[PDB]
Amino acid sequence: LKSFTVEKGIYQTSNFRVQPTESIVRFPNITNLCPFGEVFNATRFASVYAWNRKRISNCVADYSVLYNSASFSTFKCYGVSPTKLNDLCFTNVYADSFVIRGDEVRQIAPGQTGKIADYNYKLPDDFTGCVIAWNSNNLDSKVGGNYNYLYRLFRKSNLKPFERDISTEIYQAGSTPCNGVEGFNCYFPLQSYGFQPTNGVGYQPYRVVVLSFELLHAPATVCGPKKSTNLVKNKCVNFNFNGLTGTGVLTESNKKFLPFQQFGRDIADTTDAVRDPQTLEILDITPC
């Protein structure tokens, strides 16, 4: 009233509002996880020059295990926060796994040059993705030496990003026709790495997996995991179902939703009763 004296009557002083008790964050059921195990806990590894590329899509990719796990020597993500992967979603994810020398591990990063970066495995300057690597002295190394891994010495031109060249053909450095065989000025294009368990840290073979996350307008297939909480009913709560958010008291409804349909709607165009992503229950909408 802006006055010291108040005349008799009824006056509207303020507004009554129930505050929310707790915050609920939810994402859908965990199932249909991307096969990370196939990549990281893989029995065999590809060579640097021709690396294995497994596309990961149509799943809920749980990054947390890779970030948290001790087993990897390093885990670096350029484009996005490594913590963010659980929340972030990408249209397509490619995993490039290859075995390379320890000293060279640094080369797997955007804006780098070297034997791998130029000829072997090149990364985009803009590259968005994370590089995870660990040692495999125990697995890969051989006393005799593990020759199986090759990298490339010669090429017509520098390699573009993510371009891989498997080709076996003899590279003709000079004028003389190689005719498929080595000779003067003719060499097999790739050289092997001699990894042996005895060697030093830099020398040790390392398994590196890079998860590129191509981002396009196209529907995003690979999204992060679901950090969800328990459902509480009959209480004003701050709820966050898959797409939407709001505050109200979730109660059991007597509504029969179609198997495909997720959310109801008001005549008015409001959010009324929602289907819980975890449990196929229909819970009706009530402002607190």
């Binding site: 509504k255 939703f257 495909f260 349909q261 109801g264 709607r265 005549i267």
Partner: protein, 36 residues
């Protein structure tokens, strides 16, 4: 040969559930009484 697709070609525009309501929307649909 052409026939009349009188009523057919209607599919749910979205996943959203609605009830006892008339919801107008514009989507790609087979026209009524269109020529097929």
């Amino acid at each position: 040969a052409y026939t009349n697709s009188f009523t057919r070609g209607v599919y749910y525009p979205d996943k959203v559930f609605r009830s006892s309501v008339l919801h107008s929307t514009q989507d790609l649909f087979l026209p009524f009484f269109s020529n097929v």
